[PDB]
Write a protein that binds this DNA or RNA. Structure first.
Lengths: 127, 77
DNA sequence: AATCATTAGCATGACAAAGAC
DNA sequence: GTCTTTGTCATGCTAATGATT
């Protein structure tokens, strides 16, 4: 509820500020932090998601998921054309047949998975 | 009064090298000095860069102390 | 195994120095 | 304000993944 929300919000505004101060006094870039999460858990994050964590522009669910990994980080540190083709199929067949999907994947040198996902992302783009 | 961004390793190094390359080639435009400093920096070894990397680290830390509430706010077109 | 909402990164661009133009 | 560079941080768009069917 609302009480759990305000409290979780204040907790992260506060941790994000610690994370920023610690990475700066230790001489790390945002990039370095993302890369070094990768070394210590085998799970890389991009400079971008570190920029968004520190500015509180990720979702509170997203911040909560990432905060433990970052607290562990703090601890250790202290010791086109293809699109054109896909658009024209979308226009003729928005939800495509499984066979059509495979054809266009081998035709454009993609796998099925990418193709089916592309169509889903495009369907959701109607607003 | 406006708070500038802190100076990254290359830019720290490029200050002193720019001055020396201007002295060696007094007609050279700053535009051309810059291309030459880029090329020289790409060639420096990791050991040769370290003093400049640590100075940039040090200046980022100080930047925070001087300007606790600083956020980089670039102007979009 | 298949939708919809959400997470995440790639590409991009600003801006730090210098001063001649 | 523009040429010019590397490195760092911010952001717009969309590929990818998670949650829930």
């Amino acid at each position: 509820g609302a009480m759990d929300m305000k409290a979780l919000q204040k907790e992260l505004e506060q941790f994000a500020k610690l994370l920023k101060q610690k990475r700066i006094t230790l001489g790390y870039t945002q990039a370095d932090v993302g890369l070094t999460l990768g070394v210590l858990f085998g799970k890389v994050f991009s400079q971008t998601t570190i920029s968004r964590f520190e500015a509180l522009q990720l979702s509170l669910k997203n911040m909560s998921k990432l905060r433990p990994l970052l607290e562990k980080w703090v601890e250790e540190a202290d010791n086109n054309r293809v699109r054109w083709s896909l658009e024209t199929m979308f226009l003729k067949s928005p939800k495509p047949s499984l066979q059509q999907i495979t054809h266009i994947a081998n035709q454009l040198g993609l796998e099925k998975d990418v193709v089916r996902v592309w169509f889903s992302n495009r369907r959701q783009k109607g607003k | 009064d406006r708070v500038k961004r802190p100076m990254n390793a290359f830019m720290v190094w490029s200050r002193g090298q720019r001055r020396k390359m201007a002295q060696e080639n007094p007609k050279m435009h700053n535009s051309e000095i810059s291309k030459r400093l880029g090329a020289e920096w790409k060639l420096l070894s990791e050991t040769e860069k370290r003093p400049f990397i640590d100075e940039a680290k040090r200046l980022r830390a100080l930047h925070m102390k001087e300007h606790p509430d600083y956020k980089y706010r670039p102007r979009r077109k």
